[PDB]
Amino acid sequence: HQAISPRTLNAWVKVVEEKAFSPEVIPMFSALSEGATPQDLNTMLNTVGGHQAAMQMLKETINEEAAEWDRLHPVHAGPIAPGQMREPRGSDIAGTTSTLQEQIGWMTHNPPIPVGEIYKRWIILGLNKIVRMYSPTSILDIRQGPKEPFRDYVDRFYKTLRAEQASQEVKNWMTETLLVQNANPDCKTILKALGPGATLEEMMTACQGVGGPGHKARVIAEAMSQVT
Amino acid sequence: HQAISPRTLNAWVKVVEEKAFSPEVIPMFSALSEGATPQDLNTMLNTVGGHQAAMQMLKETINEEAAEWDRLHPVHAGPIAPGQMREPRGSDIAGTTSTLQEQIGWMTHNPPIPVGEIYKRWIILGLNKIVRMYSPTSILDIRQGPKEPFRDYVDRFYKTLRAEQASQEVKNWMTETLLVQNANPDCKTILKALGPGATLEEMMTACQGVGGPGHKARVIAEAMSQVT
Amino acid sequence: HQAISPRTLNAWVKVVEEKAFSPEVIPMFSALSEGATPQDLNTMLNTVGGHQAAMQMLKETINEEAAEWDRLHPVHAGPIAPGQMREPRGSDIAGTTSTLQEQIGWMTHNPPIPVGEIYKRWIILGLNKIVRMYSPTSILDIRQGPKEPFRDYVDRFYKTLRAEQASQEVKNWMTETLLVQNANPDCKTILKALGPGATLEEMMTACQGVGGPGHKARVIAEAMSQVT
Amino acid sequence: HQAISPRTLNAWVKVVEEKAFSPEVIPMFSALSEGATPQDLNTMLNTVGGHQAAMQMLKETINEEAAEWDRLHPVHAGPIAPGQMREPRGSDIAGTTSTLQEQIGWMTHNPPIPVGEIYKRWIILGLNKIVRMYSPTSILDIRQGPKEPFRDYVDRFYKTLRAEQASQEVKNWMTETLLVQNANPDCKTILKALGPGATLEEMMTACQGVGGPGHKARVIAEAMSQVT
Amino acid sequence: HQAISPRTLNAWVKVVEEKAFSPEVIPMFSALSEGATPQDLNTMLNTVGGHQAAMQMLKETINEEAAEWDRLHPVHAGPIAPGQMREPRGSDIAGTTSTLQEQIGWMTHNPPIPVGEIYKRWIILGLNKIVRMYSPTSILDIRQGPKEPFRDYVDRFYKTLRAEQASQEVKNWMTETLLVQNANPDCKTILKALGPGATLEEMMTACQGVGGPGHKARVIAEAMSQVT
């Protein structure tokens, strides 16, 4: 059997990477996995890194479809040793508890039991659910909360940046601009007054005081001074 | 015995979606599932998407009814091979651990054991409890709390909108005319002062400082300014 | 056979400790464990002190690779006693459920079954993920939050210092010149006004009021006095 | 013989894309290709996309090493023998003109001819040459020349951006910022004269006059007026 | 064994012409070519006119995939009397050197060698590459450079219009409304000063002298007089 190829698998991973779960993922998945055995589909589903929530939702959808297939299709009374083989099971359709030889026998035995397209349909339903009910996160979406200390915001920003797929110089550029840009006015005013060319430690030291009694007293007194 | 038809099942899903478990769901369910086997009723109950809490309550009601049936009806002394078949069980009545062939045999064997009507009665009791003690959520119900960051409210609003059943243009209009409308006066004042035709990022940035050391000082100073 | 030596293992531990999980860790691990059996690799990994999160990530990666190997490679139909031995398994590749004699036989039986290099590849993938997606903690990173009580910050600082790898005199110097330095301005002002040569007790008992009604009233009154 | 797994190959592609032929690829390549077939090494080298100059340099180095191997190692008559194995040729170590069966035979028949290790050495030399010489091209490196039309600069910027590995939102943000931030002083000042949020077509229409006789006369007249 | 219907081919041409190479071509191409013999796929790829660069990238992708298939799959020198069908090669899958009868036999063999799906996967990979890295050139993108003579720009615009896909009246309207609009301010000023509704030859004569010595001196004098 013609198993999956490294080029096609890597192209599938790349198209998942560039477009996180845009509606263009389903046509590419349906095009790159024609005739693929459930083992190959599981390989393409496991190879993609990141998007843990989307993968969890897809696995939940696959489990639901397997359970429904189990409910609808019962178990045969007795196996036939000569010229017969075990009927497919929902987990076997999902490829969890089945071997590649058994899947090949299913796809070859006449009349065909096309487990491949059934598993592909389940995965496509999961992908549709992901497309409808999932929004990917990005470094652009990391903004400091109204009452979030600067250190925790910076930690979240750097965690997202590390998880983000970009070149090192691009990541450094984002660190240079977005981190200062995405901040509440309380921290942004202090950062602007700090001046350009200030390292991370200086900014952390400067914004360590936001939300404390001293900063609150200072801003309140400044507000009364401006009003009167 | 023929199974359920796709048209009737799709109409059931549509009526559940439109009435949102209104008191009119019970008549439609009783009308569309006349003579339905427990497998058909299980498909009827599982096909409807959304309303996770209501489905959970229905499942708890079914489990309680099955447990009560198990308690009231004991286990027979022993099976009889010639001209007899296994007596029903609460899980088997609910169709979880029974095959369609066994259910058909139960409905056919004289005197007719009414598995379908018993399961329908249990599901109807569950639906009654759902109607009495459940209120569906909608995008209209999503309002920002008195002390909530604008980002968290926006995230909840968009999650509800994604879960909401509406056309894309309707969803866009709801986003345009509801996000600003449903907000605390502190955020709504800033949004109104922003001016018509503002992007989501601009509004999010403008309301980042709400409920912060700088904002709470400015509003208090303005308050004493107005008073004195 | 020629098992691991105390010198190589100690050098591996030392380089891991001194460089943290830097990108330079992967080359050294690829040089100090040439031909190492999976038990030797497990000994190399286990002796790493600290870095619990990194070791957990490495173990998760190893488990994922073992599961994928189990999925891809099926179970043989029947064992053969004369001139044969059990085929490797993902857990056996990881060395969890295998003996040293079995691994040596695997590496010796012709054609060779490279259990050692497969396990090394899995560990290297885990190390790469650690390098990409992990930031080691240090005493320099311990700073007190804007609303954190001084006692809690001191406790965290001393816990990190105890976990830190340094000589006793250097640790004492770190305590002397870092605890006061890394604090919010509210506590730093009090500590500076305290004067040099004050032990931990006076510093802790002089910063017990930060965040209390008395301090939040005194600083506010001072702010109004300065403004007006 | 064990083949290259899709997971390790995808990880190799990912690390090559991430580090962008930094020194860190040199260890990792040797880490993931232990005992790898020269066909597996060829797949590893072919799968990585982009960096055409780097791959050309690597192929040139491989061809040079193959030519040197051909020069140093002479041909032989190769009579029919019980081993009936032909001596390898530089192309065979390169993997271009060698099938997998004879390749495993070379790696297995006593004495073992390590075609895989020789090909790994050649690829390592090529990678070292790439690290020393080749420099990656980034979107930040795109800067409009002193006398370059704005349309050509925009075309080059978008051509480089479409090959950049980043999320779509990140690419849109790059288009928003870097396109105007990197410009000729005349083009930059004309764009700054335009209000923010202008569309790309408007910006190109405004900059179409840069470098023409009218623009030259205008700037000369303004300079003469300013100085005198 | 049936060929592709002319209506399907015409619809494929229409869909590939209407939306250029927007991602939506990838799904449609999958649907119209399901079960298609590689000769039919070659006909579909050859019939579509325009976008020569896209066709070049496509053909490069099929060539690369065929080369990889050739490398991975070796050649069997000795023919086999039972099932006397030659194993498909890299060019055989693409249909360049394979006849219709051989492809039909390959898709009807036992076991089936699916040349059609492999070829379609190659074209789909090429189409994804086109979508990522190709921007179609339209008449709206034809703008005359700052130093471009008007005759050369007119020739380029007319070449693009002749290559444009639109009705003759639409072409005339685009010529009338776009030639004057898309020009540098230096020539657009002269064209606007010329009487509206002028012949192409008159416009070319009027703006032929732009960028020359006399025009440069005239604009220099005008600017210096306006300044003073």
From Swiss-Prot, chains A, B, C, D, E:
Q: Which residues carry this modification: Phosphoserine?
A: S5
Effect annotated for changing N46D: Reduces binding to human NUP153. Does not affect binding to CPSF6. Reduces infectivity to non-dividing cells. Retains infectivity to dividing cells
Which residue ranges are recorded for the region named PPIA/CYPA-binding loop? 74-82
- Cite the effect that the entry attributes to V131T: Loss of infectivity
- Impact when changing R162A: Does not bind FG repeats of human NUP153. Loss of infectivity
Q: Tell me the segments the record calls region Dimerization/Multimerization of capsid protein p24.
A: 134-220
* Annotated site residue numbers, Cleavage: I220, A221
Query: Residues of the signal sequence?
Result: none
Q: How does it assemble?
A: Homodimer; the homodimer further multimerizes as homohexamers or homopentamers. Interacts with host NUP98. Interacts with host PPIA/CYPA; this interaction stabilizes the capsid. Interacts with host NUP153. Interacts with host PDZD8; this interaction stabilizes the capsid. Interacts with host TRIM5; this interaction destabilizes the capsid. Interacts with host CPSF6. Interacts with host NONO; the interaction is weak.
Q: Write out the function statement from the record.
A: Forms the conical core that encapsulates the genomic RNA-nucleocapsid complex in the virion. Most core are conical, with only 7% tubular. The core is constituted by capsid protein hexamer subunits. The core is disassembled soon after virion entry. The capsid promotes immune invasion by cloaking viral DNA from CGAS detection. Host restriction factors such as TRIM5-alpha or TRIMCyp bind retroviral capsids and cause premature capsid disassembly, leading to blocks in reverse transcription. Capsid restriction by TRIM5 is one of the factors which restricts HIV-1 to the human species.
Name the chain's protein. Answer: Capsid protein p24
Within the intact protein, the region shown is 144 to 371 of 500
